[PDB]
Amino acid sequence: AMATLTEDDVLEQLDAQDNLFSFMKTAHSILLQGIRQFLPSLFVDNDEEIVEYAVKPLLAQSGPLDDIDVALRLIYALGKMDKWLYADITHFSQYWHYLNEQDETPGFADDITWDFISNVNSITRNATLYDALKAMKFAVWSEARFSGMVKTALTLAVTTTLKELT
Amino acid sequence: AMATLTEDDVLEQLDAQDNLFSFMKTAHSILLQGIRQFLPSLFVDNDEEIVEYAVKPLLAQSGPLDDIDVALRLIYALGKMDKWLYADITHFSQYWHYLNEQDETPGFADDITWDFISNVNSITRNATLYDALKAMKFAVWSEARFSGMVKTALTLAVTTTLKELT
Questions:
Q1: Do the Cβ atoms of B70 and A58 come within 8 Å?
Q2: Between 20 and 30 A from B1 (CA), which of A13, A54, B67, B131?
């Protein structure tokens, strides 16, 4: 369980990450914490029996909501999340599971990760970012530059994802 | 995971139980199932993405809500349960845990269980039932009769508990 999320120490954390794996590991943790900080808005607020004996154990660490996938499902099931946002976070979660359980070799510039970002709504719906990313992909180019831009895009997805949850 | 609850096959199940332990074991299971059948009213109803991919895994058996204590806490935390009802079910759950983890000897007519029913709101708030139970307790009496009446009262608590959840 982390501290509290600013845009810019999230931005520091993610820029520090120099490979897709570390980035994704760090992203998953940032999103997790983002989601856990949103969880109290699902519940009663103003009654201290409910908070102390129901809400707290429900949100304790290693408790029943300390998993990005059960927590997401709850927010979605309560009608508190738009489908587009739900789809983005579970892709991140799916790719993290993929990288951490099956394979951690794919970098920023790979086929498999280009397909991933082609399905992240917060990336593909920003029209200039994605066009720039396609122009760059399909242009005597540079692997580092394209890689850096891929990291930018992904950082933008988690940033905009974080903004939607407060 | 059980079938679906009528008042009278719940009433059959509980009357079949000839000791407090079996009764409490059966009650805990009936309440559990009562609570699990209420869980879908917490959530989105009319959208099939949400139902199939969020609600279902949330309510699958051995999933994160298949525990009377996390499920209660959720209903309470969403503001969907009155304090009196929440207090009754967690006593039942507390006494069951007590009987199944520390001691299963106490019968219907014991000190420890008289104290239990003295704190069940659905029993003590029915004024004639509780007076009759006190008159009976504090009267050349009968252990079987008082025992049978204690079982009646407890059956009434689970029955009325069940009615409040649909």
A1: yes
A2: A54
Q: In A98-164, which ranges are continuous DSSP H helix?
A: 111-118, 121-124, 127-137, 143-164
Q: Which residue of A has its CA nearest to B41?
A: A78
User: Domains of chain B by range and CATH?
Assistant: 1-166 (1.20.120.330)
b or e along B63-99 (b: 16 or more beta carbons within 10 Å of the residue's beta carbon)? ebbbbbbbbbbbbbbbeebeeebbbbbbbbbebbebb
**Inter-CA distances, B9 with A53, B23, B42, Å:** 33, 14, 26
E strands within B25-144?
none
Interface of A with B in 86-145 (CB under 8 A): 86
Query: Residues 6 or more apart from A2 whose CB is under 8 A from it?
Result: A29, A30, A33
Give the number of A-B residue pairs with CB atoms closer than 8 Å: 64
Q: How was this structure determined?
A: X-ray
Q: Resolution of the coordinates in A?
A: 2.5
